[PDB]
Write a protein that binds this ligand. Structure first.
Ligand SMILES: [Cl-]
Ligand SMILES: [Cl-]
Ligand SMILES: [K+]
Length: 164
């Protein structure tokens, strides 16, 4: 398993503009277009992103292109962030993907705000971080995904994604 497969599983793939779990216009593999309640604004954002007149629909190759850009951005964001980088640097390859996953879903500021959890991951107190991570709006709003990610941080294995 790798970060792309993991996220492809958590985000799914849609070629037409849709509303994510929070009600925001999104497309492709979890690519947020805008937070504005305007479909019109969303379509304009889509066009700008792809570079052509899409009329709200895209091809799979285009979805995958946005996806590569989005993973790249998440990783680079983590590395530029003073709170996130040290954690990411301390984690093994498998657990690092869980951190990337959270950043992809909530953004760098969202994640950097999980200070207590971050401190526990850094200290390698897996079980404790797991409990702390679960005491969040994130867990209560998207429990199945949060469970998969948290299990990944706890065990350092892909078991939660395995056989899905
Ligand atoms: Cl809560
Ligand atoms: Cl969920
Ligand atoms: K790492």
């Amino acid at each position: 398993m790798n970060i792309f497969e993991m996220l492809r599983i958590d985000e799914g793939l849609r070629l037409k503009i849709y509303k994510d779990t929070e009600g925001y216009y999104t497309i492709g593999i979890g690519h947020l277009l805008t937070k504005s309640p305007s479909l019109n604004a969303a379509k304009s954002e889509l066009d700008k992103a792809i570079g052509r007149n899409c009329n709200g629909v895209i091809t799979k190759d285009e979805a995958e292109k946005l996806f590569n850009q989005d993973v790249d951005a998440a990783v680079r964001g983590i590395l530029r962030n003073a709170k996130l980088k040290p954690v990411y640097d301390s984690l093994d390859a498998v657990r690092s993907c869980a951190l990337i996953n959270m950043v992809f879903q909530m953004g760098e500021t969202g994640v950097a705000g999980f200070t207590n959890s971050l401190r526990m991951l850094q200290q390698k107190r897996w079980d404790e971080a797991a409990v702390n991570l679960a005491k969040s709006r994130w867990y209560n709003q998207t429990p199945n995904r949060a469970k998969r990610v948290i299990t990944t941080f706890r065990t350092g294995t892909w078991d939660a994604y395995k056989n899905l």
